[PDB]
Every structure is written in C-alpha cells, then in structure tokens.
Amino acid sequence: YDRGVNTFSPEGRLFQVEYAIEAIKLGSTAIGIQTSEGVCLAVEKRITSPLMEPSSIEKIVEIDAHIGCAMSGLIADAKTLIDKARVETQNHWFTYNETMTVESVTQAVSNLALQFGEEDSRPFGVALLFGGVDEKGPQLFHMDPSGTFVQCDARAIGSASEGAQSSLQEVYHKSMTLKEAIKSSLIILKQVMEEKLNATNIELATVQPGQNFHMFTKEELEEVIKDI
Amino acid sequence: MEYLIGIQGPDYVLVASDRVAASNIVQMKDDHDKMFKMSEKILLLCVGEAGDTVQFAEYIQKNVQLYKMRNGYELSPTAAANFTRRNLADCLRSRTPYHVNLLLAGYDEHEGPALYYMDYLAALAKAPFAAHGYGAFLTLSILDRYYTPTISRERAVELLRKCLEELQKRFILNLPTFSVRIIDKNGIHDLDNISFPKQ
Amino acid sequence: SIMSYNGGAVMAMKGKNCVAIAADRRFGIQAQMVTTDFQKIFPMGDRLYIGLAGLATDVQTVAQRLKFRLNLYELKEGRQIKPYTLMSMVANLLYEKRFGPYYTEPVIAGLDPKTFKPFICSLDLIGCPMVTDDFVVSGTCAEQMYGMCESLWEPNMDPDHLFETISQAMLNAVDRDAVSGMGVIVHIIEKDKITTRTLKARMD
Amino acid sequence: NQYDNDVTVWSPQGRIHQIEYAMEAVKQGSATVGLKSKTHAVLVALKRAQSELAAHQKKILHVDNHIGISIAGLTADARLLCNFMRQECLDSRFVFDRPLPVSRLVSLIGSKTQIPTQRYGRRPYGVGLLIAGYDDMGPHIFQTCPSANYFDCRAMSIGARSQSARTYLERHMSEFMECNLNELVKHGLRALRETLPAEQDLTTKNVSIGIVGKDLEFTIYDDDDVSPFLEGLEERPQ
Amino acid sequence: TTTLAFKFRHGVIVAADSRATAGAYIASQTVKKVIEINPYLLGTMAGGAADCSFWERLLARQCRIYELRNKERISVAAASKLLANMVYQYKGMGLSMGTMICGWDKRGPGLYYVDSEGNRISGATFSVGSGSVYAYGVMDRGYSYDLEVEQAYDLARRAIYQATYRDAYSGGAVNLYHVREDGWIRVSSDNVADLHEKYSG
Amino acid sequence: SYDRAITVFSPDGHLFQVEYAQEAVKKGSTAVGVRGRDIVVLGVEKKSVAKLQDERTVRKICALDDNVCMAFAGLTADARIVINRARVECQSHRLTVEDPVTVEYITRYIASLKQRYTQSNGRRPFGISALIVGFDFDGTPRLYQTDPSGTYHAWKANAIGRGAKSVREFLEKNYTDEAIETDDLTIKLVIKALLEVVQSGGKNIELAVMRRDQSLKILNPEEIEKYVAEIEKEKEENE
Amino acid sequence: SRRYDSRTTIFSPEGRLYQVEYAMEAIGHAGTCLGILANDGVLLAAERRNIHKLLDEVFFSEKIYKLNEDMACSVAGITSDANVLTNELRLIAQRYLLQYQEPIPCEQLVTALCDIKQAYTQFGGKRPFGVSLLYIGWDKHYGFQLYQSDPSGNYGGWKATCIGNNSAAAVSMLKQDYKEGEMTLKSALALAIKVLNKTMDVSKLSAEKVEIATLTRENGKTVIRVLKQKEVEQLIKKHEEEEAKAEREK
Amino acid sequence: ERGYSFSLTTFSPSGKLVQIEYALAAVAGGAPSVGIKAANGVVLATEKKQKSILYDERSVHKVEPITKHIGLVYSGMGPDYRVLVHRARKLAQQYYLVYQEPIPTAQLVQRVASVMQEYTQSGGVRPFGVSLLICGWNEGRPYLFQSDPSGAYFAWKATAMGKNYVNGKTFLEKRYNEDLELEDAIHTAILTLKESFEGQMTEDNIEVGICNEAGFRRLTPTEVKDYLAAIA
Amino acid sequence: RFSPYVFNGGTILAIAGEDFAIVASDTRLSEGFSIHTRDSPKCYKLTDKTVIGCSGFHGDCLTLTKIIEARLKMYKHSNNKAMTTGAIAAMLSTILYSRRFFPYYVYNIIGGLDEEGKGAVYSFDPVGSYQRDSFKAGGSASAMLQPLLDNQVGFKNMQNVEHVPLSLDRAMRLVKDVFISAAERDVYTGDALRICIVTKEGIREETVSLRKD
C-alpha cells in the first residue's frame, strides 16, 4: 500500500496528483464571475458552531490592492501560497514601478505548484480563483494543484462544483452587468448549500475599474438578501 | 565624551547620567536617556560608538528577559555582568569589533547592592565607585576625597551635588541636565532630574 | 605596547619543600588606576595555583577556558591533575590561537599531588614552556625582578626566610616600576596548609 | 509487476517499463502537426477546452526569434523545459552574440532529460516537443520523446490519434518542397482534420499556427488572424 | 542640501530645497528631495542621493507587506527601527544616509531621525544637511508648540530661504509638505527668486 | 539527512498523520477558557496529584510574555519545544519593532511552525493543541486556538482534552452575556463548566485569570473552595 | 532504498506512539534503583546486576556518575547508551559555567537533556534512547531535589522514586512508610535497607550486591559521599537486629 | 552516497536489540583466547592455527601493541580487528600531543568503546563482530579490560573469550586464585589454552604477549618453545 | 598597478519634445591622447519607442547594453508585452545599484515616448539615482551644453520672452548648432553626429559631419 510519489500510472497518468484533485471535493464551494463591468465573487463559510467567531474564517484574501483571491481545500496549505503571491507582486513594483498583471501573478504562483520532491514534499491541496482588474480590463483565472492554469469567464469550484457549473451555463451570457451577476450568483448559492442564507453564511468581494478595491463590509450583505 | 557616575552605598546604588545626544558641533537632542531597565533590580547605561550603544543594550536586554521568562526568576547581578563580558570578548576578535564602555548597577536579594566596570576590551572590575567619559578625570578626586563606606543616601545626593558643580566650572562642554536613579530593596526608583538653570 | 596597556607582575619562587607565588593588585588603563582588588592568581586544585599577567582581557579569558578544560579532566579521571599535565594543557591552549594570540604570560606553581615535590614554570604568549629550579617571573617590570632573585635566592630555605625573600623581591622591584603597584598579595603554600598574606606597600 | 516500479530496475526482458509508461502520457495530449518546405517551416496545433466557459489551453509558444516549439503531455514538464529552453538561447546570444543553431540546442535537451531517466527517485519528463527553427542552413523539424531520442524528421505528428495524421503525410510528402506558404499551411491543416470526429473541424477556437521563415520572425496566430487561412477548404467526404 | 522637520499641535511640517550638486558643478535644480513613501509616511534625503533613494524604497516594501499580513498600517517607530537595522549591516563600508521619518501614528505625531552611523533618536525639531546649521537658529527663535497653520508655513518657508542664502550648496526651490492625522498633504512649492522679492520689503 | 516523506495522501483524499495525531490531543486532560470584556479566565482540569509529591514542575499554564498566556493538551514533551521556541520569537520581535507582541502575531508563528513541521520529510507532527489568550494594546481581550494541522482559529470559549465536545455542548446552551457581566460570575461560570468535567471535587481544578493590566494570577486553593461553596449555594435554589 | 526503512517515527493506528513503548519496557528489566530525600541530605540506592567473583571492581565508582560538584545521577537501561548521555550532560553543565561563572541549577540541566532525548523521537528515524535515570542535587533556590527521567523526554519532581520493575512493588511500600520532613539520615537509610530487603529477591541482602551513595551539604562544599563496604554491613546487621526485635510481638 | 543515514538496528517488541545479539554469536564462534592479571603484569594468550602447512606465521600477528605499555588481543573476525586497531593507534596520539604523557589504560576503553557504541547507533552500518582484551601496567598496578560489540566494557581478574569460553571460565575459577606471579600466570594460561586446542601445540600454534612495569613486551617463538617444557 | 578604469569620452544629448524625443551623440572613441576610431555611435534602439545613450568607460558600456537586451526578452516571455519607458528606467536603477561597491563608470540617458505619446527623458548617475527632465546633456562636454539649453529651451533669465513650445524643426537646428560650438572647445567631440528621432511612427536616424581635428 506504499508506492512512489513520483511514479507514472500503468495507464499512464500519475499517482498522487490525481488524488490531489479529489482533496478539493471535501472543501466548501465558491463562485466567481467575470463581467465586463467588474469581477464579483462569492463563497460559503460553513459555520460549525455558534461559539465560533465568524470573521476569523476567511476565504477572500487580498493579494494586491486590485487583485483578490478565493480558496477551497486545505486551509494552511493555501496560506503558504497567499504569502508568496503577496511578496512577488511587491518584488515587481519595487523593481519596475508598475503593477503586476493578473495573469502574470499566477505564473509565479504555479511555478512551485509542482516542485515537490526530496532534494532541491507532497503536492498542495487547494484550488484557487484569482480575480482582478488590469490594463486588459477585469480578468478571472483558475488554477489547480496540478499547475494547469487557465482563464475562465465564470468558474465555480468546491464540493458542489458540478451542479454549480451546470446551472451557471444556463444563466450566463457575455453582456451581463454587475449587480445582475451578483444576485444571480447567490441564487446558485442557496440552491447548492443546505443552511438558510443569512448575514453569516456567505461573503462577497467585488472589484471594479472605478471602485478600484474590493469592499464588502457587512449589512450591505443584508441589503442584497432583502432584495432577493 | 559624555559622563556617567557610579556612587555605591551600603544598601543602595546611586547612578546618574546625562541627557545630551551630541552631533557634529550642535546639540540635537537634550533629553536623551542612556538607561536600560534590564530587570526589576538591574540597570544598564551605555557609552561608546554611536551605532553600537543601542543594539548591544537591546541584545543584552532580551537574553536576560529570556532567563526570567523560561526559568521563572531573575538573574543575579553577578551572573548578569559576566554574561555581558562574554559577548564582548567573543566577538572582539572578529571582523565586526565592538566599542562600548559600560558597567552594571544591580541589587541582589542575598548579596545586596553591587557595582561593576567594563572597558571596550571587556574587562570586569568590582568597584565601590566608577565613572566614564572625560569627566572622570575631574571627578574621581572629589569622590575619593569625600567618601565613606558607611555613607547615607542623603549625603550621597549632596556628594553628587559636589561632583556636579565641578563639571560646569572647568569644562569645554555644555552638559546642562542630569538624570538620576536609585536602586534599593524595593527596586528601581526615579529621583528628580538634576539640572542647572541658564538665566 | 599591548602588554604595557594594564601592566602587572607575577613572581614565583621555589623553596626547600614549599613554594611561594606573589602578584600585585593594581588595575589601570595606561595612567589611570581603577581599583586595587584585581585578582591575578587563581587556584587550580589544592596545593597548585596559577598566575596571569598582561592584557586584562586575556587574563580573565584564559583563566576561564583553562577552568573549563580542567573540570572535564578531573571528572573523566578520578585523580587530580599533575603539574606537568597542566603545563602541557596551557601550552596547547595558547598554541591554538597561533596567529590571533592571547596577550598573557602564565606562571604555574604547585606541589606534587603525591609528595612534597614543588614545581615552577612559565610560558610565552604562544606557548613555549620553560621549567627552572629557583624562580620564574612575568610582567612588564621583568628586569627589576631578575635583579632581585639573582641576588637574594638561596637553594635550601625554610618557609620563613622564603617569605622574607620574595617579599623584599617584590617591594623593591614593583616600586621601581611605574604602572604596577598598589599592594602585593603573597601566597605561600606547603604540604599541610596554605598561607595567604597581604603586604604593606607604597600606595602612590 | 514488481520490477515495474522504479526507473533503475531493468526488466528480465530488458525493457524499462517506466519509460514505456511515459510514452503513454504523450498519447493523451491533443494532436499537432509540423512540417517544412525548402524555405519555410510551419507547425499547426489543435487546442482543447476543459468546459464551454473555460478558454482553450494554448499549445504553441514562442522561444526565440526563429525557434518556437509545440507541446504534448504534461504542463509542469512543459514549463520546466521551457525555462531551460529560453535560458540557453539568450546565453549564446550573450556570449557569442549569435543565435543558436537548432540542431545542437536539441542535443542539450537530450543531455538534460538523461539524468532523471537513470538516477533513483526521479521521473522522466512526460513531454512531446516538436521543434521548428532556422540555423544557417534552412528549416528543421525535430521531435523528442521521454526516452530522449531526438529525430531529424520532415513531417511528424504526436498526441491522440496521430496514427491517421501520419498516413496523410507520406502520400503528399513530395508536394511539401515546391509549394509556398498559402498552400503549405493548408496542406498541414488537412492532416489535422482526420484526427477528429466527423462533426467538428476547426471553428476559430481550437487551432493555432506558428510560422518561421527567411524574412520572417517566428509568429503565432490564434483564432482571429487564423481566419484568413481557414478559407478555401473542401469539406470531409463520406 | 538643507531639510528640516518639526511637529506641533497640528501635525508635522517638512520642508527642503531642491539643488543637487557635483563638486563645484550643479547637476540640477529640480530634485525632489522629500521621498514620498506612503499616503501616511514621508522620508527625506541627505548626502548620498542613490543611497537614500534605494533604502527608503526598500523600506516601503516591508511596510506594504506588513499591512497585508496584519491588516493594519505600520507605526512610525516601527519603520524607523527597520531602517536602522538594514543600514547597520553595511557599517563602515561608506554609506551616506542621514534621513528623517515622518508620519501620523496611533500615539499621535511621529518624528524620528536615522543616520548611516546607527543613530536613531526621536525629538521635536530637526534639521539635516550641509546648510542645516543655518536652519537651526532661525527656526528655534520662531518655534513654539502652539502655532497656527498659516504661522507654521511661513516659519518653515523663510527658514529654508535663510539657509540657501548663506549656503552655497543649498538653493533651488522650496518644497513644503504638511503631515496631518488623515495623511500628508502637499502645501506649495515656491521659488527662492520669488521669495527674495517677498522678504526684501 | 533523512530524505523520506512521512505524510502523504490517501486514496479517499485525506492525510493519514494529521487526523491520526488528533487522537493524542483527545487523550489529554481538559482545559477550558472563556473571555469577558475586562478579565479573561482559563482553567485546567484533572490535576491527579500523587498526594505526596511535587507540583510546581507539572505546570500546564505558562506564559510567553507579560501579555500572553498558555494552555495546551496532548503529550507533555512536544509542548516544551513549542513553548521555548515561542518565548524566543516573541522576545526577538521586541528586538525588532518595539511594540509588545500582539496575540494574533504569535499564533501565526506557532501555526506556521507546526505546518512546515508536517510538510517536510522525516518529521513526525506535533501532538498538541494550544490555547492562546491575551489582552493586547487598546485592551481588547481575545483568545485563539491551534491544531496539529496548524490552523490558528479565534473563539470566544474553548474546550479541549478528553471530553471536549461535552463541555462545548455545555457552553452551547450557555451563550448568556449576563455571565460575562460580573467577573466572579464568569469565574463561577468556568467552575460550573469544569464541574461538568471529571470528578471535580474542588481539588483537581487549577484556574488562573488575567485582569488585562497584570500578569497571570493563579487563585489560591481557598477561593476554589469559596467559589465551589457559592456554586453549591446557587445550585440549592433549584426548588 | 525504501523497503529497508524501519519507520520509527509514525504514530500507531490506535493514535499513540509505537516505538517508545517498546523502549520503556527495557528499563524495567536489568536494573533497580531509587532515591529518597525529606530533609538535609539525599540518598541513592544501587544494585549489582552482575556480581560475578572474577571482576576487578577497580573503578572504585559505579552507576553513580558524579557529573558536577553538586550533582550526580543513577542510570538504568542500555549500559553504553548512558556513556553518550553522561559525557554530553557533563559538558552542558560545564558550558553553562563558562557562560555565567555560576553553578548550574538542577532544574534546567534536566531540561537540556530532555530536549536531546526528544529530538531523536521527533524526526529522523534514529533509534531512541533506551535510558531512564535519576537526579540528585543542591541549588541556591530549593536545596535538595530529585528528578525522574524518561526516554520520551518527560521528567518531573519527586521525593521518593523507582526505576526497576521489581521496584514497582516498592512504590506500594513507599506510599506506606513515608513521612513529611523527618529525614534523620539513619531513618532514611534504614528505610532504604528495608525496601531492598523485600524487593530484591536475593536473600539476606549481601553487602556486595548493593551500593549506597549520599549527598550532604557542608558549609560550602556539598560533600558527595560514596560510603564504603564496611558500614554497609553494620547497617545490614542493624536491620537484621530490628527484624528480630519487631517479631517479638508475634 | 545519498544521505539515507537511517539506523538498521531498532528495538524488538520484546525490548531488545537483535543485531547486537547476532553479532555476539559471531564472537563466540571465534578463536579462543585468555587473559590473566596476576599481581605484577598481565599475560595474554591466543590460539593461532594455520589451516594449512603453506601459511606463513611471521606475517599475521595477534598480540598487537598500541603503546610501549599497552597491548591488545581479540576474539572475533580478522578484518574488522584491523580497523579499530588503526583507530586506537591514532587515538592514543592525540592524548600524547595534548598532554605530553602516555595515555592510561582506562582512558582508551572510555574512548574506544565510545567509537564502538556510536558506530552501532549510526545509520546504514552493521556493528562490529570483535570482542577485545586490553592490558597495561600504568602507575604500578596493571589493568585488564574487556570490551564487546555491544559497546560495553568490564574489568576482569581473569577471563576467556572465543570457543568453549564457558569451559575455560570454570577452569580459571578453580585453578586461578587471588595472587600469582608472571611466570605462574603463563603456565595456567597455556593450561586453559591446552583445554580446547588441537593435538600438537608448538611455537606456532599459540602466541603470547605480556605486560611488565618495564613495559609491554611480545614473546618470540624461541622462548615460547622454551616455556613449552612442562606443558599446560 | 592594474587600474581597472579609463576615460573614453563622448557626449550625449536628449530633448523631450511634446510628441517626440531626439537623442544625439558623437562618434569619436578616444583614449589618452590618441584616436581609436571615428565611427562609434552611442545610440541604441532598445524598443520601437526607447533609445538609450551610454558614455564613460566603454568596456562597461558594452556590458551594460547586453544586460538590458536580455532582460527585455525576459520581460516579454514572462508578461506577453513590452516594457514602457518608465519601467526600463526603474529597472536600470536596480541594476546600477547592484554593483554598489564596484560601480560602473557610465553616464546614462534614456529618452523616448511615454504611454501617452509625449517625450520623456530620464537622466542617471553611475550609482543609480534618476529623475525625469525635459532635457539633459551627459558626457565630457556636458558643462558646455546645459546652460545654453536653459536659455533656449528653458527660456530662463530673459525678460518679456514668451513661452512657445519647441517645435520639431526648431529643435533640429538647436541640436545641430550646439555640437558645432562643442567641437570647437572640447577635444573629445568628434566628427559624425548621429541623431535619432523617436516619433509615434518609428525611429529616424540622421548623421551630420563636424570638424575632423
């Protein structure tokens, strides 16, 4: 029951990184949508106990002033990737006086997505969504523990990732607006979660070219629930 | 360049300092503090190279605070003084030589009060009074003159008045205001700021 | 010089069945004394001492490094250390710093741990041992100390006249020196007891 | 089966099965076709999509002003050899102030991939590099393998169902020398269309073409300037 | 080269000249010597221009990462401590850096002074440069803690003017910044030749 | 040099060793801790003294600084390495930036230390789970907790050790802000909660408080008898 | 390469350790030691496992390893696994003295060893120590102290202790016949002769099979005493006299 | 190598070390030997059989000197003996370079066993398969020590290792006593060597080295043939 | 002993226009009292909108040019775009500081268009400081060219002089006049005057001869 960490399958794929994709399935769900007006983003917190403080569990974590994030999977393994992605944007600005673009952030992140080994560890267990606004307008990307990096218009990952992507292809088009995409996302959220939607289960993050930061204090959250 | 003094009593340690932070020819800061509270019964001034005085006081501060935090009790002033002499003597023969000049002033619960001495060549000396700077050449005669091993602390402040009035009589320096501590069985006590008015 | 930074003087002298060692008390920086209680003679076991002179940094440093290796030796073995064994130990410790040398000149005096047989030696700053049968001296005022012991030492001497000879040797040589003085302590040890006296010298 | 675990262990038949498993990883990637004329070298690739909303995974990537490569297999081994590839080109550009000839650069790759195929605890690189470029003596089409046996070919295809792609090539390999670029390119994408099911071909979302030429730097087109090349085609017969 | 900085009731006032020379030759007249670090911190330039420009830019790198990890802006005494430790590692290798650190803190105003010699002192008034000694005298004659905003502008404006008038290496134009509680704000940028006609009458 | 991985993936998508060491935390003694608005409190249980031996060496509540207090579970030896490491880091933080260490900063140091101690090769994970209580500058009392995976995590009340979920279920029906009103009621809250733990005859209860302006002050074994007396008096009013 | 590893680092599937429990059961066999203090002074009881009549016994010192001028230890387990630890712990106590010029307190010396013994259990797959040992010592803060050590790196303060599996029944005696600060140093010695009489199954308690070493506080010397073989015998005849005296009531 | 460094010797579930117990089995199948300390010097005697008439006897040696007052024999396997001889040869020199004094016999056994104990705990090597016997007349009183592959060491009046080592153990308990001379010790050392040897005992069947306070000395085959009169 | 530095000469001029940038340099490469060549331009087309000039020690000029040309390609393969004008000036400052304790002996001027089509000129120093200016002159004849463009381009020290923006054709004859006057008094100013003009449509080069003494 003990085989190599660095061994191809007899069918020909791999051994362990195939299991890494399975580890994403036991994490909470998340939805991010790229619009021509901006990038909205959503996640579920999965509260366990009322003794637990809710704001100590975060999923949206800022990388730069104009780049957000979304994680699902093992928590503290993602905290290694967040701290590096913050630093490597600061190496970019303090050597070039410009902001690193949203695509070129994830290029530096996905380099050591697969660099595990003995000389020179195990592969990571988290899938990420990177939204942000740069010179090519708002962008949205998706990566994985296998280092496969791709751009998506509106990707949804997590435990309910299959039923989310099926329902999302029904309701998406290219000429969406911002607030239309926001309330359309939480309709998908309340279908795929099990608890009642309130001010504590979810949180949003919306970056715009105009409103340059993502800014989602609470009780704006209750303003959207009463409007749906 | 700057002046310190070390009057040791029967059950108290009387230390004083100056508040002048020098510059090229000007006086930038006139309420500087040379003192560093290592623990509840151990003080530490410093005199030396302008970059070296801060960090070695910071380095000795934390390593003594490790000892109290791990073992649950305070170092003796003897063991504290001999930890400082080790760190200067080790990195003396190195590419980064260290250049500071300061003793300790400590009160033990068993051994009572104590006063040490240190050179930048890291030599220890148990002493009943000491001084640094150029003012030591003008004050170690008075403090040798009017000394008694059984002196009281009211006389010792008055003896410190005699030591300080000869400073602003025959110097080429300014040195207006002098800060004074006192250490006893109850720990660190701050006496008033000894000064000299201008008008 | 670097040796003349703090100054000092250490003298040892062999008697009939006893040995005596003495040093000064002054601690100073080139013109300015600080105190009169700077220890320069350190016990290494019973009936065996060591004296150090030179730069006061290496006085306090070598006396702790030698004490470091000594306690490890007397716990791996059950016995005490022989005086020849200590002389080879000190000569090792100085030669390790061959090019960054310690600025000190040790003097070892002591008896046999089996018999009453005395032993004296002195070493260089890099570690050349040198054993004699009458006296060894070290410090800044070396030439004044040779003029005493070449004119006062006798071969077979009771512990009384040995004390009187090494006292007059120190008080006349150190008072001729400028940077050394401020009191002389004298250790005179024998088979049965250890006698330590402080002499009345010129405090100028 | 017990001798089919590590790279170091030989077989009793004499075939290290770890390399033979890495050949299967190349056959899982999407197909691509490269070929050359006397004066031009054109490689055409086929993209796939993970979903409808997801963008298509890119295949061709620029390396130097004359060298550009295609890809098949893994993506970690893609970028790991790519960073080694871009590094070696600018080194001789820095040292000798000249571009590398294509042939001896590929010999550095076979030396690079040799060590993890012999020592312990190191996988081979599952990768499918097709290489095109100019040295001083014309175009070249190279292919590699995880066994590090580089081949100076004239037209090959690697990836999923390239079996049918090769068969079109030898019955038109004589035409691949005198024809210029407008039909040289559309000779090549007539070979991709038999590596497909019979109901979709090339609809401006899944094909990319890289060309290196005499007075032409290596240029990659994708889905918008490919549309001038995609006209003038006959449909598949039945 | 002449800078000064002082804090009072309404924040901190920072002023500097704009002339950078090379021996007896003037390189430029429009050098921005007050290096803007953050929307809430300001740094100066003293002696080595590229030395002060590099390390304060490197200091801004650590303060930004500190804010992303701790969800809080850094304090003024913190940034002066980080800068003193970085420059100390190159002690004796010949760095020229005598800058100042300014900014608002949770403990109020913040003013520190960092040298390339390991000096790190707090205080109320400072003046750095080759013509710094000409700025101490006119400022201390006019300094009070209870000054007005328009009063503190004209004190620091003439103090730079009296320095450049006496000194040869100082000159150019007078930049003037105001550090407030919300953040710093640029006040004005005046020419010395225009101030000469103002203080003539 | 030991080039061998210990912790790898399972076919169902989990780690062995992380969910394999949390049972060692479950076999430790219990220690709870709540926070008020001015005075925090934390109390260990199951002293289990040998009644003829020393007790000042079996201390399960220590401090990293004059602000931060410790309480843990699991095995004894692994806590000693983590504690004596964290005493160095909180003191070296003051050698840097001159503030006292915020309680959120030291929990990120422990969790990041414990995470790479599972990520690396040839290294067993730790088998402890700590409670980190401090009232920093601005005087805001708060507490955190750790995990052998290395996830720092802020609560308002915690229960660990052998019988954690039962005490957490007791606090689950005990969300009253009135118990966090009076300080001695909050101490009696923990003493009532630790009474739900194993036998708790007033002798195995070692509690310690911190009034946010003072070092940790352990209550003497007379107020423990006094507070259990008034808890018995408050329980007598059930009729 | 990979199939030859022993995996002495992974936990048990029960959720506990797996290799340390195998090590701790070796301590119970091959050795039996104890120590008792209640007042000024502290004793150590040893036992000759190999008592063959062709040994030299010219070491004139034994399992009692005087590691300091104020401390010593009594070890039981693998024999030369201790000689690594005794030479190491002797130098930790000595490098402390170089740093401070003050003798090492007995508490933090034990913490220095227990961090070394844990470090082989944490990482590597190195074979852990099969060594448990005791501690005696005087300090400036608490005076006379006892400490038990474990292969796991765990320790604790004690006033009457045990090592051997035969001495597990001695703990039942030490709960029955212990006092609270009445250690006259004949009552503590006659108790130790009484314990090793019943526990050690060698009849009549021959004086060559056991060994007693004590530490008494002098004016400033802290005399460590390894008492000779003559006064062992009169202590045995004292205990045999008390057994014949106490049986008169029956 | 690579950096594996893992020890191949771990504990049993019973709580024993199995490879050390197996290494002692190779010691017990070694050549027999004996060593006797009798009141003025130590006598060592081994049992050297050439397997054929073609071997040379003046080439391979068993009684081996370490210093001018320290000798050393063994019972185990041949090639592993020559490793820790050359280790102990060098290790006696760093005492003499530091202290300028000949090393005591107790001081090697502290240090040689420390080499040997750490070598078992170290990674990727087997233990040795050699037990030793070390002799020397340091400071008047002579010494006789015995190490083993388990790292331990003892101090014997008289003992025997090799084959039939328990039979010569009962023989030395009855025949030997408290005190003897050097010449009486050689007589009983051959008497316990004749207990387990083959038929003919010549100057090449055995090989004997002794210690005196005059120093360590190895006997030539002339006097061994001369002492062979009144055999055993 | 082996001294690692030597002075070579050359003079670089840059003018930030409203929608253009003019970079000019001579072609003399001298050493000591001798002439190595008369054809050695200091212009280097980095991108289509950026030209750098390098003076001082010529061995460092050849090295520092080839370092920048590599990092332009390393930017593009990592970011799928080209660098701007200000990004190159920010990158060059870290490169010059990277050898702080064994410096280059090179005076650098970067001219070219910004991302809005306006002239930007960045001057440098041999240790790494930089700023954005309207016109700078570097090299051996730098002191003979700065105060004249203060009068003409800067319009300083003139009473009742209007501030007309400098056109393209007026800027051309300003460059051609100052190198004639510089060649009369400097001995390092050579023969051919390479003039590069960066517009929003490409880079034009032009060579004007001077006196050959």
mmCIF file of N, CA, C and O in Angstrom, chain G residues 6 20 26 45 55-56 63-64 72 99 103 107 122 147 170 192 199-200 245:
data_model
loop_
_atom_site.group_PDB
_atom_site.id
_atom_site.type_symbol
_atom_site.label_atom_id
_atom_site.label_comp_id
_atom_site.label_asym_id
_atom_site.label_seq_id
_atom_site.Cartn_x
_atom_site.Cartn_y
_atom_site.Cartn_z
ATOM 1 N N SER G 6 12.723 1.442 8.656
ATOM 2 C CA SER G 6 12.027 0.810 9.768
ATOM 3 C C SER G 6 10.809 1.587 10.247
ATOM 4 O O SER G 6 9.953 0.995 10.918
ATOM 5 N N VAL G 20 8.420 4.009 21.234
ATOM 6 C CA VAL G 20 8.832 4.436 22.566
ATOM 7 C C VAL G 20 8.318 3.471 23.624
ATOM 8 O O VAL G 20 9.014 3.187 24.608
ATOM 9 N N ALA G 26 12.178 -1.905 28.328
ATOM 10 C CA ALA G 26 13.516 -2.411 28.590
ATOM 11 C C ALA G 26 14.092 -1.868 29.885
ATOM 12 O O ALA G 26 15.008 -2.480 30.444
ATOM 13 N N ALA G 45 20.156 4.472 45.948
ATOM 14 C CA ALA G 45 20.316 3.037 46.126
ATOM 15 C C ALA G 45 20.625 2.397 44.783
ATOM 16 O O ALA G 45 19.929 2.649 43.795
ATOM 17 N N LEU G 55 35.402 -10.307 38.626
ATOM 18 C CA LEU G 55 35.531 -8.923 38.222
ATOM 19 C C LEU G 55 36.591 -8.225 39.068
ATOM 20 O O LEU G 55 36.943 -8.669 40.162
ATOM 21 N N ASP G 56 37.119 -7.127 38.531
ATOM 22 C CA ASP G 56 38.147 -6.372 39.240
ATOM 23 C C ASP G 56 37.551 -5.494 40.332
ATOM 24 O O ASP G 56 38.067 -5.463 41.455
ATOM 25 N N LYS G 63 27.640 3.087 38.745
ATOM 26 C CA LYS G 63 26.407 3.703 38.257
ATOM 27 C C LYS G 63 26.147 5.116 38.779
ATOM 28 O O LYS G 63 25.547 5.936 38.082
ATOM 29 N N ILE G 64 26.563 5.400 40.011
ATOM 30 C CA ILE G 64 26.625 6.772 40.499
ATOM 31 C C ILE G 64 27.683 7.506 39.680
ATOM 32 O O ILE G 64 28.881 7.294 39.880
ATOM 33 N N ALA G 72 24.860 14.404 40.724
ATOM 34 C CA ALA G 72 25.213 13.099 40.187
ATOM 35 C C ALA G 72 23.929 12.417 39.735
ATOM 36 O O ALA G 72 22.827 12.935 39.931
ATOM 37 N N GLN G 99 29.765 30.345 30.651
ATOM 38 C CA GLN G 99 28.989 31.482 30.186
ATOM 39 C C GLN G 99 28.665 32.453 31.316
ATOM 40 O O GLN G 99 28.661 33.670 31.106
ATOM 41 N N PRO G 103 27.305 28.168 39.253
ATOM 42 C CA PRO G 103 26.943 26.757 39.070
ATOM 43 C C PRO G 103 25.529 26.570 38.546
ATOM 44 O O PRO G 103 24.629 27.370 38.800
ATOM 45 N N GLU G 107 17.333 22.245 37.899
ATOM 46 C CA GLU G 107 16.125 22.132 37.089
ATOM 47 C C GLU G 107 16.454 22.177 35.607
ATOM 48 O O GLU G 107 16.144 21.244 34.859
ATOM 49 N N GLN G 122 11.404 12.955 17.591
ATOM 50 C CA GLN G 122 10.667 13.856 16.713
ATOM 51 C C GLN G 122 10.912 13.526 15.252
ATOM 52 O O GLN G 122 9.972 13.292 14.488
ATOM 53 N N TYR G 147 14.808 14.112 40.564
ATOM 54 C CA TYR G 147 14.126 14.147 39.279
ATOM 55 C C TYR G 147 14.215 12.799 38.588
ATOM 56 O O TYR G 147 15.282 12.183 38.534
ATOM 57 N N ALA G 170 7.885 -1.598 45.275
ATOM 58 C CA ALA G 170 8.477 -0.697 46.254
ATOM 59 C C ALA G 170 7.694 0.600 46.366
ATOM 60 O O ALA G 170 7.730 1.254 47.414
ATOM 61 N N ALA G 192 15.766 2.499 53.329
ATOM 62 C CA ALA G 192 16.300 2.020 52.060
ATOM 63 C C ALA G 192 16.829 0.598 52.172
ATOM 64 O O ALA G 192 16.752 -0.169 51.205
ATOM 65 N N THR G 199 12.223 -6.170 48.163
ATOM 66 C CA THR G 199 12.096 -6.105 46.710
ATOM 67 C C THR G 199 13.103 -7.014 46.021
ATOM 68 O O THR G 199 12.726 -7.875 45.218
ATOM 69 N N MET G 200 14.387 -6.835 46.318
ATOM 70 C CA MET G 200 15.424 -7.664 45.716
ATOM 71 C C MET G 200 15.304 -9.093 46.232
ATOM 72 O O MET G 200 15.434 -9.341 47.435
ATOM 73 N N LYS G 245 13.843 -7.881 66.522
ATOM 74 C CA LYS G 245 13.214 -7.164 67.623
ATOM 75 C C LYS G 245 11.715 -7.012 67.402
ATOM 76 O O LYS G 245 10.927 -7.173 68.340
#
